[PDB]
Design a protein around this ligand. Structure first.
Ligand SMILES: Cc1cc(F)ccc1CS(N)(=O)=O
Ligand SMILES: Cc1cc(F)ccc1CS(N)(=O)=O
Lengths: 304, 304
């Protein structure tokens, strides 16, 4: 019992983190097989970052300009290419600690673990969600760029995120491992405003299921509601609309707890309308939306 | 920028987790050098757990009754001894992945990372604090026992916690790696009530420093206070008394932010007296006390 915002074990990803230096810029790279993946803005001075022409900046670069360091051993770069907003440095050595892995582009509301790194060295690991405005609320200082977000499925690491930007509002933007940004963001030091950060409704409900399971029930009410009625209330409170897909995905939690999804929606409705009244659910004074339904099933069943 | 409840990277500890089976009971063990550490209640049936005589139960046990499995390879047990509430199984093979390590008994209010494991397999990693009532608020299902709490100092893993018990109130009790329980708890299925879970005042203040650093300042007031005056208010709100030691430890944050410790104490006082008024600090609607001063300095400086 007890419920915690858990990160996946980082070991398999710790083994893939290297330091990439290009001139004076040092940031993190991901070493999988004989390729090192890193943000392409490694080639930029902070002057370049105002309006960088990456194609033009990259012409000036050679394999030997990219210094890749794995622990305290240097990797020989035998090739370099730009895929969207990431650099792929082909090294002459396959990472002997390469786990089974996939590159996956996640959807907003989906959760993953970030291994925050500096100079190819892991500092800490924390659990994130892709916000519906395609930002993440990370902890990233100078040097953290190229730190990656991942999910682990038994022994296979699905890499979903590489860190690129902090927006002027102190939220974080980045790419999948094919170097395509989440949301409308570009690797340029420019006025980039994120849209409305809406609450991930399906996640809040999953977390309310997790609460009931763990004995926090005070918020369970006598009322039910409808998808349309609930969604009127969701709209007013900047909550993502709830689909039959969301209701289907919550099925097992509904089954395990014997609380219908729409009854829990009515509980959520009252919580939105009446607040917590200074009470707490699983030791939080607001509604948590960075647990997925899959996150609760797998935590409240002990999946390794 | 941005502030996150980060766990240490778990890799070095993932390498030390094994499965220990004794009869029908399976739980987690820690394999360091040629010793496997695990909870001594591995030798108990859930019948034994009501009033176990561990010395008597252990007489009946031989080296070959302890089945230690590291991944999918069996370790030969050549010796077994009881140190307090842990078993030390001497195996014939040194863990080749043994990191530099120490066993340290932590003080209440001190924070550490837990690698929650099942059948010697890591499931997730999360950051904890030793509560002032010597419990932790973990996430632990059946099989999680022998999952360990640790701090990492560069490359050295300080092991501070092994998981043993969930109390009837769903909080968690355990030992240091010498098998001495934190608090008054015993490895017995009996009415064990935890005392008052007081807030770790120094940690809340450190987190308020972290807030100011990260641009959340709304709670900064015009008032200061005294250690004695603040502590009257601390007492009323089940906050740990603040010592000159706590004030000394917050020095660097006070220095970095140019907010005197006692001024921040006055900010905390108003927050205790007036609540948040439905506002949030670093995306929390209550006062976080599971970051230490050392946790903020090292997060808001990017220590690897
Ligand atoms: C331990 C774990 C494993 C997993 F596969 C999915 C989730 C979790 C828990 S959580 N929601 O804090 O990430
Ligand atoms: C990343 C990190 C490293 C460290 F040495 C101490 C703390 C932290 C951040 S925290 N407070 O979330 O654990």
């Amino acid at each position: 019992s007890g419920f915690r915002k858990m990160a996946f074990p980082s070991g398999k990803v710790e083994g893939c983190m290297v330091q990439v230096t290009c001139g004076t810029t040092t940031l993190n790279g991901l070493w999988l097989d004989d390729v090192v993946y890193c943000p392409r803005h490694v080639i930029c001075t902070s002057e370049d970052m105002l309006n960088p022409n990456y194609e033009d900046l990259l012409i000036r670069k050679s394999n030997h300009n990219f210094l890749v360091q794995a622990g305290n051993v240097q990797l020989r770069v035998i090739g370099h290419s730009m895929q969207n907003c990431v650099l792929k440095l082909k090294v002459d050595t396959a990472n002997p600690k390469t786990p089974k892995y996939k590159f996956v582009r996640i959807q907003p509301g989906q959760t993953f673990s970030v291994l925050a790194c500096y100079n190819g060295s892991p500092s800490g690991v924390y659990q994130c969600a892709m916000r519906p405005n395609f930002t993440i609320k990370g902890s990233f200082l100078n040097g953290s760029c190229g730190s990656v977000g991942f999910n682990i499925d038994y022994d296979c690491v699905s890499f979903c995120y590489m860190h690129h930007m902090e927006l002027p509002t102190g939220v974080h933007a980045g790419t999948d491992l094919e170097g395509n940004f989440y949301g409308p963001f570009v690797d340029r030091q420019t006025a980039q405003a994120a849209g409305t950060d809406t609450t991930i409704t399906v996640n809040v409900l999953a977390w309310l299921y997790a609460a009931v399971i763990n004995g926090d029930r005070w918020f369970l009410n006598r009322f039910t509601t409808t998808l349309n009625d609930f969604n009127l209330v969701a709209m007013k409170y900047n909550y993502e609309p709830l689909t039959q897909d969301h209701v289907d995905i919550l099925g097992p939690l509904s089954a395990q707890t014997g609380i219908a999804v729409l009854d829990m929606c009515a509980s959520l409705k009252e919580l939105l309308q009446n607040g917590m009244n200074g009470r707490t659910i699983l030791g939080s004074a607001l509604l948590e939306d960075e647990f997925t339904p899959f996150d609760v099933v797998r935590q409240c069943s002990g999946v390794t």
